[PDB]
């Protein structure tokens, strides 16, 4: 049985609690995050969703045209979707800094410095950064009194934000050789392993990759998928953005564009043969800046029901202009 | 710094010019253009354009059929092409980095010299149309890679026991001697490929995030090899603002994006010769067209005045 080229079963899932969305390059990652968030929220009115970002550029705020911050806020126009933009690294520095100060005048796992081993042991910084994020969330849940059913992580445009899933095994290997700090490491290792318990369960968390139909994007996506596999995180979906089905479009005249399409077609076919088992969802190029709830929802719709270049053209051109 | 390759195309000191760029960035076209440009401006000298890509990109580019044996490009007096497959034409390979590369390269250098000894005519300069994959020239590190190894053995072997050491019979010493001979071979080439006036690498890329990222990586790798990197050609630029405004908001949209990175490129690689090359919808194929296009590597293209020239190719 063919694997539907859409995210319908995910957007419809009542089992997933953590959905990570990423893609390097200018591939429409942010708008994909918002679209998945909206689509999930509209399809499950009964539940509450959190869309979190780490990008210091406040991509979410300029995506929706609202102002989000460290405090969750419901997207204006929706009942069950909220956004929060934070900076884990910054808050970590502030917290670590004060801990260093308390040391000189004497996440509890910081007394003094466990952060110095950062530039030595891979994934400790990331684990600490992530724990910061998980903290800001729970604190928001405890105050507002309402817990989020599902969280969409608009992954950070750089680094390897979730390399910490390797931390546990990276430590055991180290702790054996080496056999204060030692106690903080074991406490950290226990924290990352309870998370892996969650993040490693296919029914609980998954990662959807975002990319454009180009050689470098395809290879970057391959790289990303291998990495996610090496973390035991589920990867079953790939969103391919900016596709211009020039093959038959309104005002479709431009030969340069036709040339581009021919190129995209080339790789779209490689992607389909390479990731047959994946949900490979094709999304139309939408010249402009899909911004604001309305347009984002109109466009996000194609994540659930595959886009038809023939039939649905009218819909995207109501946005592209 | 001038936004062209005029000084290189005009150099009478360079003997080896490598051209590379990953992705569909017009690497091959660039290789041919540089070869032609060099050949046309130095009729007095003989040039060799060699490729490794099994697809026979050179033959498809010129519309001629090249192979293991050098052949003059039809219509030119001092430019010849040679398409080889080094790999096609000793298992420490999957263990020590750069050994296979060095072996592959030496193969290439051998098919060349044997072509020079037969034809009786030596090539003054060679342009290497680098392979679209792997790390073809990581062997420049092999020498230091080996010294380190043939040293860790001395710190271990000379720090073991008469029995233990001697208790390892098998044709390995049959290697200690060949590794030292190969190390000597890569180091004589390194003396050549490491001299700025003798060899250089021109990068090719498109003005997009992923391509800039990739060429950034390429440059770092080349510097770690002590190979000179001073030029970067940026292909497929559609100067849509000057495009007689042939309309298409999608293309104008693309251009604004290319403009954004063209800017970053300028600021990041200021000391480099950053040559902007116009998008040329089609497949610049055949000597004539390649020549017409290649000219903009020497004298910077002008979207306003030169437009007519590239559209007589569309
Ligand atoms: Zn166009």
Curated annotation (Swiss-Prot), chain A:
InterPro entries on file: Anion-transp_ATPase-like_dom, ATPase_ArsA/GET3, ATPase_ArsA/GET3_euk, P-loop_NTPase
Other information: Present with 17300 molecules/cell in log phase SD medium.
Functional summary from the UniProt entry: ATPase required for the post-translational delivery of tail-anchored (TA) proteins to the endoplasmic reticulum. Recognizes and selectively binds the transmembrane domain of TA proteins in the cytosol. This complex then targets to the endoplasmic reticulum by membrane-bound receptors GET1 and GET2, where the tail-anchored protein is released for insertion. This process is regulated by ATP binding and hydrolysis. ATP binding drives the homodimer towards the closed dimer state, facilitating recognition of newly synthesized TA membrane proteins. ATP hydrolysis is required for insertion.
One cellular-component annotation, GO: endoplasmic reticulum
Binding residues annotated for ATP, in chain numbering: 24-31, 214, 241, 284-291
Family the UniProt entry places it in: Belongs to the arsA ATPase family.
Catalytic site positions: 55
Impact reported for residue 254 to S: Prevents dimerization
EC number, as in UniProt: 3.6.-.-
Top-level class of the enzyme under EC nomenclature: hydrolase
Pfam families in the record: ArsA_ATPase (PF02374)
Chief localisation class: cytoplasm
Protein name, entry field: ATPase GET3
Subunit architecture: Homodimer. Component of the Golgi to ER traffic (GET) complex, which is composed of GET1, GET2 and GET3. Within the complex, GET1 and GET2 form a heterotetramer which is stabilized by phosphatidylinositol binding and which binds to the GET3 homodimer. Interacts with the chloride channel protein GEF1.
Subcellular location as annotated: Cytoplasm; Endoplasmic reticulum; Golgi apparatus
GO term, biological process aspect, one: cellular response to oxidative stress
GO molecular function, one term: ATP hydrolysis activity
Alphabetic keyword roster: Arsenical resistance, ATP-binding, Cytoplasm, Endoplasmic reticulum, ER-Golgi transport, Golgi apparatus, Hydrolase, Metal-binding, Nucleotide-binding, Transport, Zinc
Binding site for Zn(2+): 254, 257
């Amino acid at each position: 049985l063919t694997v539907e080229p859409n995210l319908h079963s995910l957007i419809t899932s009542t089992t997933h609690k953590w959905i990570f969305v990423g893609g390097k390059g200018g591939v429409g990652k942010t708008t994909s995050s918002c679209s998945i968030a909206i689509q999930m929220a509209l399809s499950q009115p009964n539940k509450q969703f959190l869309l979190i970002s780490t990008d210091p550029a406040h991509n979410l705020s300029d995506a929706f045209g609202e102002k989000f911050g460290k405090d969750a806020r419901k997207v204006t126009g929706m009942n069950n979707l909220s956004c929060m933009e934070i900076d884990p690294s910054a808050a970590l520095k502030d917290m670590n800094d004060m801990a260093v100060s308390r040391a000189n005048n004497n996440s509890l796992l910081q007394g003094g410095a466990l952060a110095d081993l950062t530039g030595s042991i891979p994934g400790i910084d990331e684990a600490l950064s992530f724990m910061e994020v998980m903290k800001h969330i729970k604190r928001q849940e405890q105050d507002e009194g309402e817990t989020f059913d599902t969280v969409i992580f608009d992954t950070a445009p750089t680094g390897h934000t979730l390399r910490f899933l390797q931390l546990p095994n990276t430590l055991s290997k180290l702790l054996e050789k080496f056999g204060d700090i030692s106690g903080k490491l074991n406490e950290l290792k226990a924290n990352v392993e309870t998370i892996r318990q969650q993040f490693t369960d296919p029914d609980l968390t998954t990662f959807v990759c975002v990319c454009i139909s180009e050689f470098l994007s395809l290879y970057e996506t391959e790289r990303l998928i291998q990495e996610l596999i090496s973390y035991d995180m589920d990867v079953n979906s790939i969103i391919v953005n900016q596709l211009l089905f020039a093959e038959n479009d309104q005002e479709h005249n431009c030969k340069r564009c036709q040339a581009r399409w021919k190129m995209q077609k080339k790789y779209l076919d490689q992607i389909d043969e390479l990731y047959e088992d994946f949900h490979v969802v094709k999304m139309p190029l939408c010249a402009g800046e899909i911004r604001g709830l309305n347009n984002l929802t109109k466009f996000s719709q194609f994540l659930n029901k595959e886009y038809n270049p023939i039939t649905d053209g009218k819909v995207i051109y109501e946005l592209e202009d």
